[PDB]
């Protein structure tokens, strides 16, 4: 059984399978991929700074340790110093956890994790290490600085969050949701994207707060060729508050990023790739999200590349306020065969869109011809690797240029790990079906989720000229029967308006679309099941969704009344929608497991899915879209936070069930990624053991040119900001 805030010694580890994809690449394509990979992995180190105050020091300390002694050499030292093999394994798993999350907080769940061995024994190991013999000042200073925080589970440190009860480095430690909202109002007022920004609040001698909005860039306060960003670098007064806009965040890291993007440009396959890379270079050099948007436009225009990539401060899941971007970058190789199913989904998409439970007036004006590919990841840098992506996030781009849907096939493969024993909360016969179809349904669900889910729905916008992007005169709100009374104004986005629920609410919507359209006797032909096979996917897909909603309670924090993972909160919401429909469609029952410990059972009534489930879901989905399109945050919050509410009300007793969900939880596995190395002429792919030690090695070998320089850089950047926390 698992303990909260530690990675179990026996945590699963899998190695990404990238060899076949890599073998397909031409020499030029390999060099392109090589440099973009380096760009991504460099940039991923910024995520340490975006996670916790101590994370950059812990990375620097681990990096030092394993550069001097690999896992097998360090074993010999550690065991000679009194660690058991089990305690040494705990340290390897911890280090692998830090590497693979780019921080000492889980990317999926936002909870701290600490090494599962005595601090004093680890001290002995670190201070007697070869790293410490070579650089005693550097190693002692690092241990002094981060050793306490490496281990501390004081309540206020256990979860990421704003205010005094959680940790965040998107903001200084004295910031609250109030500060974040005020800053968002400011940012919006200056038409300045939050994505590549942080917010620091410092007080003067009289305790008056001053706000710094700091942009990520290579360049600092010195003048540069650009005008659009530099003209913004100044002080402002906003509702009585002093605001200064600065840049230079992560500068020497982003400098390495841009060096490699420049070199990749030499191997670009076409002018879209060359121009997109030039714009990203401008974005990271100057601190300009407008430049990132221009780059992103070129990227959408680059259709079906052999080497696909994206990079920057992309997703806003981990900002407690919900508008700032965590750095990520990926490089992936097209898989022609696996892409096929999604290409024909594109062949019935424009039609299937009409089947969603809102009027065409709430749907995008022009249906842009969809781009949906299956890729094999070579590099996915940052806090975690998703199974699929739908990007860019810039809604103005999404409506005028379009967007790309990507399914990551060799990541999907890993996620297809499910034993019967690990199939908790299911009755016996339900377990069988699950092992048969979960894999099949995933494409069904993820197909609909990205293309029809994130890809659907119009945002109602009023421009500076009070001229709407819809027909204010004839469009009718199907819930109220009235003409539209609210909309998005200039400079407002989905994230700025819905802030803390934006990510979860939209994931809920996309999931609901997938679940809804999975009922379609036709969609089960595009993926191809057309019978009892088709129906089996259905019962399983819905059984999976309701089981997932129960499992989701792991990611809820009762004391904070707070959900920590957007996708899990969304699945809980869908579960509660289906429970609300009543009529015995779904029940959750407390039980006792064969091990004598509390258990539970999820019961889904297949004979009431279309008669009860589907109209409940249709009504729900309609409501979601109407409030999103109209930017009605009060209504959207009221609706969503309502279903997301967790109580011990009968008959479900979700708070009690949560204790049982925690007792039987399984740790999400760590994924090892390969390296590419430029051995003179040729690029080679380096692969690693599927273990905590292989994961450590994969990072030990990841920066052979300048690893010690990166340790120094992270250490310096952390130290510059230390007063904020």
């Amino acid at each position: 059984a698992d303990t909260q805030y530690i990675l179990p010694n026996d945590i699963g580890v899998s190695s990404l399978d990238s060899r076949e994809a890599f073998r397909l690449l031409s020499p030029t394509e390999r060099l392109y991929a090589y440099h973009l990979s380096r760009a991504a992995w460099y940039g991923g180190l910024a995520v340490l700074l975006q996670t916790s105050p101590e994370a950059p020091y812990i990375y620097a300390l681990l990096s030092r340790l394993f550069r001097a002694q690999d896992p097998d050499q360090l074993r010999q030292h550690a065991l000679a110093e009194g660690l058991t093999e089990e305690e040494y394994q705990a340290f390897l798993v911890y280090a692998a956890g830090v590497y693979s999350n780019m921080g000492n907080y889980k990317s999926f769940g936002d909870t701290k994790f600490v090494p599962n061995l005595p601090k004093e024994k680890l001290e002995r190991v670190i201070l007697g290490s070869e790293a410490a013999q070579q650089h005693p000042e550097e190693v002692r200073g690092l241990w002094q600085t981060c050793g306490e925080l490496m281990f501390s589970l004081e309540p206020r440190l256990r979860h990421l969050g704003l205010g005094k009860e959680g940790i965040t480095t998107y903001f200084s430690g004295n910031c609250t949701m109030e500060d974040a909202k005020l800053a968002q109002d400011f940012l919006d007022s200056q038409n300045l994207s939050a994505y590549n920004t942080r917010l620091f609040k410092e007080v003067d001698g009289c305790g008056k707060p001053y706000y710094e909005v700091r942009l990520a860039s290579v360049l600092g306060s010195e003048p540069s060729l650009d005008s659009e960003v530099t003209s913004k670098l100044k002080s402002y007064e906003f509702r009585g508050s002093p605001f200064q806009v600065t840049r230079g965040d992560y500068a020497p890291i982003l400098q390495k990023v841009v060096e490699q993007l420049e070199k990749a440009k030499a191997y670009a396959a076409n002018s879209h790739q060359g121009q997109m890379l030039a714009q990203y270079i401008e974005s990271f050099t100057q601190g300009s999200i407008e430049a990132h948007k221009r780059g992103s436009r070129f990227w959408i225009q680059d259709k079906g590349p052999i080497v696909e990539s994206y990079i920057g401060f992309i997703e806003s899941y981990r900002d407690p306020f919900g508008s700032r971007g965590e750095f990520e970058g990926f490089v992936a190789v097209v898989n022609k065969a696996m892409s096929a199913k999604f290409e024909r989904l594109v062949a019935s998409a424009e039609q299937l869109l009409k089947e969603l439970p809102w009027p065409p007036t709430f749907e995008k004006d022009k249906f842009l011809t969809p781009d949906f590919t299956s890729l094999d990841v070579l590099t996915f840098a940052g806090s975690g690797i998703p199974a699929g992506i739908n990007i860019p996030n810039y809604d103005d781009l999404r409506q005028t240029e379009g967007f790309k849907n990507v399914s990551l096939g060799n990541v999907l493969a890993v996620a297809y790990a499910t034993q019967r024993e690990k199939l908790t909360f299911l009755e016996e016969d339900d377990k069988d079906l699950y092992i048969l179809w979960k894999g099949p349904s995933f494409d069904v669900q993820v197909g609909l989720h990205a293309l029809l889910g994130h890809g659907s729905g119009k945002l109602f916008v009023q421009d500076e000229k009070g001229a709407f992007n819809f027909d204010q005169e004839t469009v009718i709100n199907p819930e109220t029967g009235e003409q539209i009374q609210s909309w998005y104004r200039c400079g407002e986005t989905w994230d700025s308006k819905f802030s803390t629920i934006a990510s979860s609410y939209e994931e809920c919507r996309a999931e609901s679309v997938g679940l809804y359209l999975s009922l379609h006797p036709q969609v089960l032909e595009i993926f191809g099941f057309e019978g009892a096979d088709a129906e089996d996917v259905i019962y399983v897909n819905w059984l999976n969704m309701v089981r997932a909603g129960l499992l989701a309670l792991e990611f809820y924090t009762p004391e904070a009344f707070n959900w920590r993972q957007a996708h899990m909160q969304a699945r809980f919401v869908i579960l509660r929608v289906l429970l609300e429909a009543g009529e015995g469609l779904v029940t959750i029952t407390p039980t006792t497991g064969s091990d004598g410990r509390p258990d539970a059972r999820v019961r889904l009534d297949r004979s009431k899915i279309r008669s009860v489930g589907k109209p409940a879901l249709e009504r729900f989905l309609r409501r979601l879209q109407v409030l999103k399109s109209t930017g009605d945050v009060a209504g959207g919050r009221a609706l969503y936070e309502g279903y997301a509410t967790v109580t011990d009300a009968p008959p479900e007793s979700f708070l009690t069930l949560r204790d049982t969900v925690l007792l039987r939880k399984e740790s999400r596995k760590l994924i090892v990624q390969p390296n590419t190395r430029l051995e003179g002429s040729d690029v080679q792919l380096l692969e690693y053991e599927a273990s905590a030690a292989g994961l450590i090695r994969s990072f030990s070998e990841r920066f052979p040119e300048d690893g010690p320089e990166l340790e120094e850089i992270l250490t310096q950047l952390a130290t510059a900001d230390a007063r904020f926390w």
Partner: peptide, 5 residues
């Protein structure tokens, strides 16, 4: 947007 699993 990312699809996590």
């Amino acid at each position: 947007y990312g699809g996590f699993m």
